[model samples]
Target chain A: GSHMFSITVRDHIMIAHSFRGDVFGPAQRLHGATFLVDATFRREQLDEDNIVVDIGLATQELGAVVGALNYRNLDNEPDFAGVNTSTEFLAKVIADRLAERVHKGALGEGARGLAGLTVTLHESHVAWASYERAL
Target chain B: SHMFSITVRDHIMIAHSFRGDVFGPAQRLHGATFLVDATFRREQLDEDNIVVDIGLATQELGAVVGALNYRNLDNEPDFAGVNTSTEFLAKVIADRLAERVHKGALGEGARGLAGLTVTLHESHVAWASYERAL
Candidate 1:
């Protein structure tokens, strides 16, 4: 009864940033991350072509999303002025943007039927975070 | 001072059950579709200016996962008395991949890789990983 299908496409970004709290310890120092971002589209059933979404478009749009943050320090971005820009927080930021794109039909007409979206950012081999929400 | 890294993905489907009450309903026989992501890291890139050959990494990863794909773990001799948990399988796959890297199966370029990480995404909201230094 829990049948569902999802298709994920990946892209990557490289950026330098610093953390603000004592909990972050040495992370407070300027460092860089090569984040591999994955965006997954989910639906209870597949579309006519037997895919949850167009993987080609998913990959391209995801590339655009990550492109906005690539090679820049989040600390210097006006949008992230006081924000922590942590991996978990960035996941939500990307997910929300993707949702907005889907609503605007940027993913094509077939994407309107998607039930949800999940965005994950792999900060390194050992750690990652994700954000998921209903469409 | 930063290192280089690359990842390849593959998937497997299998049925299994756990032996502990901690697993709750998961103790019963159930199936899972795991999208496995394997990462290789190194302090420096080879002459190719790449971490490893993407083609070789993907192919080798697919082969490592094929050994257990579409089979019930509970019935496999390799896991006779094992739990078959996502985390356990992650290590199982990582160890096998590490062996391949050691034997040059992943390619001579991959010999420069200093570490490995394998993640098993069990579902939309859950996953596990195992990391090891080469």
Candidate 2:
């Protein structure tokens, strides 16, 4: 009773953040990641093509979205806008952007869009979170 | 000042189950390792007097984990009516544990603990988490 499509994009980003009093108290740090971000779409039924969606088209759409942030310094991005620019928040922002695009009918014909979309962003060997959309 | 600290560990459960209907490649044998890590948080100073009772937390965790331990998840009574996926399992475990904490079963001292996290590591390099607001 379930159908899903997912794609993983390997990309990188440089980020800097500060932590309050601790062993690293009030310290600023910078690091880069060979990140892997996964986006998944769930639907009730497959399309007329007997598929949830075209994998190539899904990949292309993901690429277009990832291209905007690939190899960029997240801290300097204009949309940082009080956001931490951490992997967790990045996942949410990316999920929201892609969900909006799909809802606007940008994906393709027979792409029933998504009932739910989840975006997962990974940093190094640890630290990650997935932002999921409801409905 | 607000302080936060967390520890992450990895554990896995390998399981196999069957489906009566054909859906995809999953209709055959299946194996999965659900990786898990936990996080704890509080909003006060840490002293010899207190640091949130790890033992009590683990006890509740044991009860929840015990429910899924050494059994066929698909054949289990609780999961009999649902399609058991790693994602759904993680959420169910989270809910069970959270319910205990909210019911004051953990202890009065732990009432102030802000949250608990259960991150299910589904694969070597993939995982998901269920966070409860307390």
**Best of the candidates, lDDT:** 1
Docking class of 2: incorrect
* Model 2, span B1-134: residue lDDT tens: 57564434545464546453423455465667665555666777345355456677667677777667656665677766555555456557767766887787667656677766676665553444555566
Could you tell me which residue pairs clash in candidate 1?
none
TM-score of 1: 0.53
Q: Write the per-residue lDDT of candidate 2 for residues A52-83, one digit (tens) a residue.
A: 44445566677778888877766666787455
DockQ of candidate 1 (2 decimals): 0.03
| lDDT scores of the candidates, listed in order | 0.83, 0.60
What alpha-carbon RMSD in Å does predicted model 2 have with respect to the real structure? 9.2
Docking class of 1: incorrect
Off by over 4 Å in 2: A1-33, A38-97, A100-135, B1-23, B27-29, B45-51, B102-105
